[PDB]
Amino acid sequence: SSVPTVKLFIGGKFVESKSDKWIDIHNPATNEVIGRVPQATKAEMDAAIASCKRAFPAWADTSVLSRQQVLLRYQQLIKENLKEIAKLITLEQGKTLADAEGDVFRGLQVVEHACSVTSLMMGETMPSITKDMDLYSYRLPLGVCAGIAPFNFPAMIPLWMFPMAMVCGNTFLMKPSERVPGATMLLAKLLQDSGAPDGTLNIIHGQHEAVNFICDHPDIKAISFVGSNKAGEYIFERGSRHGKRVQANMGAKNHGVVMPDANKENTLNQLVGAAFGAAGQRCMALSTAVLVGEAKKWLPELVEHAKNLRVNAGDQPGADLGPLITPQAKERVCNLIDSGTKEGASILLDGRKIKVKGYENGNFVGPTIISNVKPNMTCYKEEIFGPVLVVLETETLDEAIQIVNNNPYGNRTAIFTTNGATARKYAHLVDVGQVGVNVPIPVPLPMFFYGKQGIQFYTQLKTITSQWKE
Amino acid sequence: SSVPTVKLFIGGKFVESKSDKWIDIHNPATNEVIGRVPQATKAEMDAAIASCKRAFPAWADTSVLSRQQVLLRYQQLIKENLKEIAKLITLEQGKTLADAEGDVFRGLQVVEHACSVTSLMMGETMPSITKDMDLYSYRLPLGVCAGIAPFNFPAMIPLWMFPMAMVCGNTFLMKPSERVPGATMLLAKLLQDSGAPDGTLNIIHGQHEAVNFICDHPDIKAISFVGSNKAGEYIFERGSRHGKRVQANMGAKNHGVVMPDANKENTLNQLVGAAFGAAGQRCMALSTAVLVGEAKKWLPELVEHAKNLRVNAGDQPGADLGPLITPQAKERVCNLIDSGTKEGASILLDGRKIKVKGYENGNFVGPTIISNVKPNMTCYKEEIFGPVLVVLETETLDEAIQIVNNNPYGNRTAIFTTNGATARKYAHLVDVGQVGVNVPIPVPLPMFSFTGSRSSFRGDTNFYGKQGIQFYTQLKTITSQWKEE
Amino acid sequence: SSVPTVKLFIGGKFVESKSDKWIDIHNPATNEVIGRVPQATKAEMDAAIASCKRAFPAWADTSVLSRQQVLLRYQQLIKENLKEIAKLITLEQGKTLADAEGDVFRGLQVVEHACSVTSLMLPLGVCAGIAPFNFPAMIPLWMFPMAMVCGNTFLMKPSERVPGATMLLAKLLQDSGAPDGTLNIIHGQHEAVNFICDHPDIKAISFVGSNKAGEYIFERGSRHGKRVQANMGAKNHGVVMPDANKENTLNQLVGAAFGAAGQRCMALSTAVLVGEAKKWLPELVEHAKNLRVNAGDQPGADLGPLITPQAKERVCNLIDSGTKEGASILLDGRKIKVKGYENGNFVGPTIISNVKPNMTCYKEEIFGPVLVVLETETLDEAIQIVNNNPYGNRTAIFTTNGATARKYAHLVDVGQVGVNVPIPVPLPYGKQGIQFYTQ
Amino acid sequence: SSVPTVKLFIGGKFVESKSDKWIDIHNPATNEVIGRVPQATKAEMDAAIASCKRAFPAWADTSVLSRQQVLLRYQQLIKENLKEIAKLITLEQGKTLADAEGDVFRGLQVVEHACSVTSLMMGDMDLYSYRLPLGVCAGIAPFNFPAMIPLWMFPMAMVCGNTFLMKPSERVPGATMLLAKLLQDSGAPDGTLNIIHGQHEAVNFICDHPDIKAISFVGSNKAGEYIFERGSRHGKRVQANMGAKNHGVVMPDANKENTLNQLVGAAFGAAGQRCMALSTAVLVGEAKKWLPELVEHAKNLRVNAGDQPGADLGPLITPQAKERVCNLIDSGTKEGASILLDGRKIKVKGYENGNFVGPTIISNVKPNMTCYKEEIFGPVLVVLETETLDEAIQIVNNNPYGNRTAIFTTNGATARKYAHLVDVGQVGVNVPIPVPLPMFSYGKQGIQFYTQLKTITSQWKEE
């Protein structure tokens, strides 16, 4: 009853860990312990690796269609248990039920995209490129893969890391978030129910020690990560040290540009939705707003629209944003807001002293709007990972483009304007690949990895050149 | 007596034929004999077949990249010599300069499409479908191919036949139209200048005997033909009885439904242009249309728009309607007009009596309009291949759809209407997949195959697209289990 | 007492035929009447076609995902009833339980292949299927699932001699949530094929097996203007090089040549021992003798009895003609006697050698457990012999040398060449099948 | 009188460098100074970068079809002046006329391949897939021995719409100058291509300069790693097409004569100064008995200047290469290995002062010897032996770096087993060099490298 343990998943059994280190799973809305996740031991991780290795050959020999049937049945089962996963997410991570449903829906979309890989697995051939010389190439699995998610999306991150590696024929060793592993456990249960061969998927919970193990052990051929730039680069280097390939989303510091010729109502609505959605904990979200020209006059309207947000627990009906993941995150956000205020920034809206009825012991932080910010301020450089919207002011679109380009870590950007020529100019001049015209977050799916990129990453390309004569 | 003859293309080099039988080349604007074409003898055809066979191995060993580079050089030379080809077409076939330009442009687009067959020639593979079981897929050239073009397109059909057959590794033995061969000879000269190895393309002439030889000769692996229904069926039969694959795009009496909720003036202009453009000689011409409800009130406007066409030789400025290719075509058109008259159809406008100033010697026929037609009229059964616009009496969309379905031979159909639900219902019940909205004739789009299986087409495969590759190549699948314990 | 009567499938319910032409079906292992099949009347076939027409709109409007889920549930139901289907096929067709399980496995494979039709575009309409007695389970799962998932309603006419397997399959399909009237099944003789070809309601027809029957069906379809993908059968020529694995090659030959009593649509019934490979005839005969001939349900059996006594008579007549014409019979099974099943249509493994290409056995389709062996001195002669075959769909080459296999695959005119493996790609259709069932 | 001086190519104008530091170009057949290459000054490199920047807008605005026609005209010009390029190559690098012609033909084929980028470059919520060029590209050439490579780098970067700053081999510039002249004659806009010469300083500038967007390098692994690190440090996207040692496995059932001929041609071909050379051979099973015939075939090779008729392999580019090869062979000799054929004492008649090294065959070599670890880049073939295919596969896998590998055998089962169990990407069956093209994993990968994808998502409406 008390402090319910979180079991592991090795081979085909939900074996429980006997480790010494244990971490408590707190509800972000009440700080009440709802579970205890163990830090997997060296022996348990070795057993998981052995299971992955033993399952690798059988799963690889399995035809691509046979594997894809498993993913199809797994997607169907997920669709059947949508409400259960949504409620588990709302309970553990604290996000609203609608946010969890949307996350599971994006995960289903990614699973379908992976199921659609069956055609890409075929290789090309060129008969008789020269006299009696044939050419053809093969795509084969790499080996044992792994994934890491410190505190980000609990379901979508696995639902994009693991299904692709499976469809490619590899075995996956997932290290889910130490704070929200229940969703991953339910997903693994639904998978095992889908008829997946035992040992194809293994799950081990652990702290930085587990990440170091995964990076050091050689049997891991590839590793995937999504999170802060620091941990991203750290894992990338630790993997490259051992030769194994690694891919990581290191930053999502998106900049939103608002031109004077834009729909004020819809623009402000989308800005408030993307900036404070999911309490700003989501990696991809408009956090830096650039007002060009007379757009500065919309600051009072922006603050008014932000005041209309309803802070409440993820389970209470009529909620717009949930509490933060941990009290430490709230303290960090408060310290960052205090630093911004000390550096001369004006706090148009302050949520540090928010008090939710019936959940005062939760990690809630109200919508925070910071204006008069400059590129040299901490609020601009540091990634908040919270419901804080920093606003900068510029006179021409060239200044906004330059500010956006100065951002070293940036993958998604948006511009709000009705002039198509202005949008095209911004897209051509901006140094960001993904651009959103009147869209807050283009391609909300986790990516820099999909389509051709995912296959090229999770499969090696063998090339055979044979010239038989006699 | 010996009017300047036209060159042949044997052994990858322009040479003359030793035949004693010649066919006169008449300018349709003046019926002047501008040239003569001799039917290739058995010797010339045998030499062409031998050269194609000799070139087949080298042209197949020739990497697809080099073939596509040659096709690109040919595209470039066409783009440079566009005006010469247009002049040749206008002089020989008689169509206006604009029609020749459009023909050359469509041929250039088809060449560009053929240049992108890179991913199509390559095969698929799937290693280890089971324990030690590798599957391979290869597409190999067939051999020497033959092509018979109609009298309508001395450029478009040759430019359909050359790019695909050549890029697929096959050597082609082309047969142009005896009434318009010069344009094809100039196109072949440009192709040879583009770097085409000698022997990959060969040109012969002959009305019926050459077709019989091509269909009977065993070295011909495949045959491509475009023309009438009876001729296409005869060619298909003569080819299949010898074991050779044949594809024939035969007559296609496309129908255009005129809905009351459409652009009136624009729809009428498009109908007038399609039914009378290039003297309506196009086999794919929109010679028939359906007037639904209010569309029938516009017949006076049809007559007005028809009278607005500048009936003049194709070389004069502003010419809209050209002359008939030969006096026999004009005779057939006039006989069909007389038959429509006898059947009781209302010929609202008759261009049978119109003549062109300064070109009365030409086989000119003005824009003719026949309205109040129903499936009972014989002119609806037969195709005019001339400047005759047929419009039928109809009351509802379902009746028009049924009338169009009653047409046994038709490859394309269109409907003029701004209502989306109307076009949806039309496409759902009409027996045609190539449906166009507010367009008289769906323009070819070679990136996919020109699908057709009605009485207007013979053969299980089509000319270009995926089906084009399937036709000009042979699919071989190899399953290998290399294991020795 | 009263032999069971197989009912038709119309409007989503099993209904008994009103016709009096109740043909009797015998078990091939005992030639005992296990049931009767009626020749559907004109009225019953018209009602089935009308039901298919009325059901086509709803099934076509159904989303592709719903049809895919239906096919997945049907595959699941088959997996749950694989044993029953295999036992029914063995009792009705005579082949061994292993062969029936393999047929069900190929059915599952083709269903999974059809599941990949997520989106490629429209359905034509009423589709028809004509299946011979070669494969009761596979042929339906070859034809009707594709047309179904593509949005078309299918009218299946199974083999008159083995309707039970497809009837249980259709029952399981209806259990999978298939809308009523989507799939219709009728029975009848040549008259049924004549109706299906004449009735303009049918827009597409699928047929396999006999060559002349397929030609007739294609001609009738072209006469009535219907899409007919008549994939007629063809002989398969296997070439054995001296450097090939003797044991493995002989095992493959014995399995493919005599497997399922050689009644399958395509089998490696011809072997060309080029070079010193001819010296392997003793081992081949010994391996053929090791085969066990017994009822499909008795443990320890490799090949079952023939479909009907007429098939046995025809096979015996062909073997006698080959012997009289000059061919030497290395192994004779015409007078085999299975213990407890002497009345069956059993025919022991037969091996014929010294057969020239112009002989009857080489030209005629045996459709039985007979293996004709030819000899040559160079691979070019074998390639020429294989190319001379007008109707050749599959060919195999056994060799450990890569250059030899590559030369054989390149010089041979056959489209499908299986190197070191017999009966390559036993499934053929595919995306061309989608094009066929669509417009 | 004085030796000719190589001149830079900036802004479409062949300009002589005003630098003080100069480097001499020696004929590898006689070591005679035939030319001088200058050390590009900071100002000249800045001017070249400025020219590339000013030319990038116009060259990017041009449609892909115009660039394709330019590449076609350049290919035609190359086909016309193939003999001159071959002569210059044989003069500067020492390769035989046939080898130089083959190099020119491979470059022509790579240009033809690059021409096939016509459509691949083009690439309520709308989703565009525009692909745009990066900007000013750069390409450092080998720091050991060259072999084509300009036609690998600049044609693709240009047809993709980018401007290129080419750093040719300081030891064989003339070919690059002739190619640049032909390109300028092909109608290429001035400033689209710029060429500067220099030592390590030039590489440091190219890697550190901010305007450079991408860099491409071929050659040894050390310089490759250095350039990759220095580029990634400044945010540069770089692909290090590093060379690697190749391993060819021979089975007892392989074609004896053909296998020996192909081995002798791939190992001692072009003096072994190629990253594609099959510098090592593994004789599995009874294949060991083929050593005498291999030595005889190696002896049959005739060593002579690249211009003299009847030459199979030419001399080394510099005497330092000969010294390094001699030191590496002496190391293997001291380490216990045996030399079946000694080429150190080769003395070409009439060219005794050239950098010639005859065919060398080393046997009994183990994986721990320097000959196996170090890249010889010379006419040296180390022959190993094993008793089973598993040992050869394990030896091939143990090698850290590798791009090409070959298996000589007639049994398809053995070939497939080797191809599947081997950890190398390109596997050749009865072929020493599986693909003499710039794969070094440029095709679709090159298209993706020289272009940046932008998935413009828009909810724009008439409002």
CB–CB of A124/A114 below 8 Å?
no
> Do C391 and C235 contact (CB within 8 A), yes or no?
yes
Q: How far apart are CA B431 and CA C267, in angstroms?
A: 41
Please, which residues have CB within 8 angstroms of residue B69's CB and are 6 or more apart in sequence? B195, D72, D112, D115
Core vs surface per residue A431-452: b (16+ CB within 10 A) or e:
ebbbbbbbbbbbbbbbbebbee
In chain A, breaks (C-N over 2.5 A) are found after: 448
Is residue B282 marked as binding?
no
Q: Which secondary structure element, helix H or strand E, spans residue C66, and what is its range? A: helix C64-80
Selection from B167, B216, B142, B191 nearest residue B67 by Cα: B167
B385: nearest Cα among B220, B254, B219, B235:
B254
Residue type, A111: V
Report which of B65, B13, B6 is spatially closest to residue B34, judged by C-alpha positions.
B6
Dihedral sign, CA of C296, C298, C299, C304? negative
Question: In angstroms, what CA-CA distances link A50 with A43, A185, A212?
Answer: 10, 20, 18
Task: Give φ, ψ of C234 to 5 degrees.
Answer: -165, 155
Question: What CATH number is given for C235-419 in this structure?
Answer: 3.40.309.10
> Given an 8 Å threshold on Cβ–Cβ distance, is A136 in contact with B128?
no
For residue D412, the chain C residues in CB contact (below 8 A) are 400-402, 405, 419-420
- The answer to whether the beta carbons of residues C51 and C59 sit under 8 Å apart is no
CATH class of A253-437: alpha beta
Which residue of A466, A469, A470 is the best one to mutate when testing the D interface, meaning the one whose CB has the most D CBs within 10 A? A466
DSSP assignment of D378-436, as one string?
A: SSEEEEEEESSHHHHHHHHHHSS--SEEEEE-SBHHHHHHHHHH---SEEEES-SSS--
Neighbours of chain C (3+ CB pairs under 8 A): A, B, D
Task: Give the 3-state secondary structure of residue B122.
Answer: coil
One DSSP character per residue, C304-366 reads ---SSHHHHHHHHHHHHHHHHHT-EEEE--TT---TT-TTS-----EEEES--TTSHHHHS--
| CA–CA distance, C215 with D341 (Å, rounded to integer) | 71
Residues 6+ apart with CB under 8 A from A296: A393
What length does chain A have?
Answer: 470
Residues facing residue D429 across a β-bridge? A466, D407
Assigned architecture for domain B8-250+456-478: 3-Layer(aba) Sandwich (3.40)
D425 CA: distance to closest CA in chain A (Å)? 5
| A310 CB burial (10 A radius; 0-12, 13-18, 19+) | exposed
Question: Is A209 assigned to a binding site?
Answer: no
Nearest to D103 by CA among D314, D409, D263: D314
Cβ-in-10-Å burial (0-12, 13-18, 19+) of A114 comes to buried
How many residue pairs from chains C and D have C-beta atoms closer than 8 A?
Answer: 15
Residue of A367, A432, A421, A392 lying closest to A258 (CA atoms): A392
Which residues are within 8 A (CB) of D192 and not within 5 positions of it... i.e. 6 or more apart? Answer: D52, D55, D59, D158, D163, D164
Method: cryo-EM
CA atoms within 13 A on the CB side of A272: 24
DSSP for residue A129: E
Q: Report the distance separating Cα D344 and Cα D324, nearest Å.
A: 12
DSSP D313: B
What is the DSSP pairing of strand B245-249 with strand B255-258?
Answer: unpaired
CB contact under 8 A, A65 and C112: yes
- Round to whole Å and give the CA distance between B297 and A121: 60
**Residue C164 contacts residue C227 (beta carbons within 8 Å):** no
Other CB atoms within 10 Å distance of the CB of residue A53: 14
Tell me: is residue A179 an annotated ligand-binding position.
yes
What are the residues facing C329 on neighbouring strands?
A: C352
Q: Is the dihedral of CA C252, C255, C257, C260 positive or negative?
A: negative
Which whole-number Å values give the CA distances from C236 to A96, C256, C390, in the listed order? 65, 10, 11
- Tell me which CATH code domain D247-429 carries: 3.40.309.10
Query: CA torsion, points C228, C234, C240, C246, in degrees to nearest 10?
Result: 90
Smallest CA–CA distance from D411 into chain B, residue: B482
Which active-site residues of D does the annotation give? 275
Q: Could you tell me which of A208, A201, A192, A212 has the C-alpha nearest to residue A174?
A: A201
The one-letter amino acid code at A134 reads: D
CA distance C34 to C46: 29
Closest alpha carbon to A204 in A5, A3, A374, A40: A40
Question: Distance of CA D49 to CAs B60, B141, D186, D205, D451, Å?
Answer: 46, 49, 22, 11, 19
- Using CA of residue B232, residue B234, residue B235, residue B237, what is the dihedral sign? positive
Among residues D410, D447, D437, D397, which one has the least CA distance to residue D282? D397
Q: How far is it, in rounded angstroms, from Cα D297 to Cα D291?
A: 10
Beta bridge partner(s), residue D362 = D339, D382
Dihedral of CA atoms B384, B385, B388, B392 in degrees, nearest 10, equals 50
What is the 8-class DSSP label of residue A279?
G
The HSE-up count of residue C100 (CA atoms within 13 Å, CB side) is: 26
Closest B-chain CA to C432: B467
Q: Which CATH superfamily is domain C8-232 in?
A: Aldehyde Dehydrogenase; Chain A, domain 1 (3.40.605.10)
Residue type, C127: C
**CB-count exposure of residue D50 (10 Å: 0-12, 13-18, 19+):** middle
User: For residue D396, how many other CB atoms are within 10 A of its CB?
Assistant: 24
Helices (H) and strands (E) in chain A, counts: 15, 17
Nearest to D131 by CA among D461, D441, D458, D444: D444
In a 3-state reduction of DSSP, which class is residue B326? coil
Q: Does domain B255-437 have CATH number 3.40.50.170?
A: no
Interatomic CA distance for residues D401 and D373, integer angstroms: 10
In the three-class reduction of DSSP (H, G, I as helix; E, B as strand; rest coil), residue A35 is classed as strand
Beta bridge partners of A24: A36
Which candidate, C8, C12, C13, places its Cα nearest to that of C37?
C8
Q: CA-CA distances (angstroms) from residue B171 to A236, B11, B221, C413, D435? A: 55, 11, 10, 19, 29
Among B119, B166, B171, B169, which residue's Cα sits nearest to residue B144? B171
- Cβ pair D413:C401 closer than 8 A: no
Distances (CA, A) of A139 to A64, A464, B132, D446: 12, 11, 15, 19
As given in the structure block, the two tokens for residue B301 are 């406007």
Chain breaks in chain B following residues, C–N > 2.5 Å: none
Closest CA to C71 of C127, C116, C128: C116
CATH class assigned to D8-243+440-457 = alpha beta
CB of D329 within 8 A of CB of D370?
no
Which residue of the set B115, B283, B334, B379 is catalytic?
Answer: B283
Which DSSP category does D190 fall into? T
DSSP state of D160: T
The CA distance from B157 to D376, in Å, is 59
- Of C348, C346, C370, C345, the closest CA to residue C359 belongs to C370
Is the distance from CB of C349 to CB of C331 less than 8 angstroms?
Answer: yes
Question: What DSSP assignment string belongs to C166-198?
Answer: HHHHHHHHHHTTPPTTSEEE---SHHHHHHHHH
Q: DSSP states of A72-119 as a string?
A: HHHHHHHHHTHHHHHHHHHHHT---HHHHHHHHHHHHHHHHHHHTTTT
CB contact under 8 A, A128 and B61: yes
Which residue(s) pair with D303 in the sheet? D313
CB contact under 8 A, C415 and B475: yes
Q: Which amino acid is at A17?
A: S
d(CA B329, CA B335): 10
In this structure, which amino acid lies at residue B254? N
Q: Which string of DSSP letters, residue by residue, matches D224-243? A: HHHHHHHHHHTT-EEEEEE-
Residue appearing with tokens 């040299």: A376
Of B445, B392, B260, the C-alpha closest to B433 is B445
CA separation (Å) from B350 to A65, B313, B364, B389? 65, 19, 13, 10
Beta carbons within 10 angstroms of residue B351's beta carbon: 24
SS3 label, residue B435: strand
Does the CA dihedral C180-C182-C183-C184 come out positive or negative? positive
Using a CB-CB cut-off of 8 Å, the residues of chain B touching C400 are: 484
A102 neighbors A91 (Cβ within 8 angstroms):
no
> Which CATH fold topology does A22-250+447-466 show?
Aldehyde Dehydrogenase; Chain A, domain 1 (3.40.605)
Which residues pair with residue C358 across a beta bridge?
none
Dihedral Cα D154, D156, D158, D162, nearest 10 deg: -100
Alpha carbon distance A205, D297 (integer Å)? 62
Q: How many CB atoms lie within 10 A of CB A335?
A: 11
- What is the distance between the alpha carbons of residues D305 and D314, in angstroms, rounded to a whole number? 6
Backbone angles phi, psi at A68, to 5 degrees: -65, -30
Burial class of residue B55 (count of CB atoms within 10 Å of its CB; 0-12, 13-18, 19+): buried
The contact set of A with D (CB < 8 A) is 133, 263, 418, 420, 423, 427-428, 433-439, 442-443, 460-470
User: Is D247-429 the same fold as D8-243+440-457?
Assistant: no
**What does the buried/exposed string (b/e) look like for D342-352 if buried means 16 or more CB atoms within 10 Å of the residue's CB?**
ebeebebeebe
d(CA C81, CA C6): 19
SS3 B90: helix
Distance CA D253, CA C401 (A): 10
Binding residues of D for NAD(+): 141, 143, 167, 170-171, 220, 375
- Measured between alpha carbons, how far is residue D452 from residues C8, C129, D134 in Å? 62, 52, 6
Q: Which helix (H) or strand (E) holds A277?
A: none
Pairs of CB atoms within 8 A across A/C: 21
Q: What is the DSSP string of A156-213?
A: HHHHHHHHHHHHTT-EEEEE--SS--HHHHHHHHHHHHTTPPTTSEEE---SHHHHHH
Phi, psi dihedrals of residue C378, rounded to the nearest 5°: -135, 150
- Name residues whose C-beta falls within 8 Å of residue D301's C-beta, 6 or more positions apart in sequence: D264, D268, D312, D313, D358, D359
φ, ψ for residue C236, nearest 5 deg = -120, 125
What is the radius of gyration, based on Cα positions, of chain B? 24
Distance, in Å, from the CA atom of C395 to the CA atom of C412, rounded to the nearest integer, reads 9
- Spans of all domains in chain C: 8-232, 235-419
- Give the contacts of A211 (CB within 8 A, at least 6 positions apart): A148, A175, A235, A238
Helix axes B97-114, B64-80, angle to 10 degrees: 160
For B248-260, the DSSP string reads EE-----EEEE-S
Q: What is the resolution of this structure in A?
A: 3.0
Cα(C288)–Cα(C313) distance, integer angstroms: 21
Give bridge partners of residue D361 from the DSSP assignment: D341, D381
DSSP character string of B336-396: HHHHHHHTT-EEEE--TT---TT-TTS-----EEEEEE-TTSHHHHS---SSEEEEEEESS
Max Cα–Cα distance, chain C, nearest Å: 64
Euclidean distance between CA atoms A90 and A88, whole angstroms: 5
The number of residues making up chain D comes to: 463
- SS3 call for C427: coil
Question: Residues with Cβ < 8 Å from C189, sequence gap 6 or more?
Answer: C21, C23, C39, C160
Query: Which of B433, B477, B481 minimises the CB distance to C420?
Result: B481
Residues 6+ apart with CB under 8 A from C61: none
Nearest to A281 by CA among A362, A410, A384, A158: A384
Per the document, the length of chain B is 485
Mention every residue, 6+ apart, whose C-beta is less than 8 A from residue C435: none
Q: What is the Rg, in whole angstroms, of the alpha carbon atoms belonging to chain C?
A: 22
Q: How far apart are CA A303 and CA D301, in angstroms?
A: 85
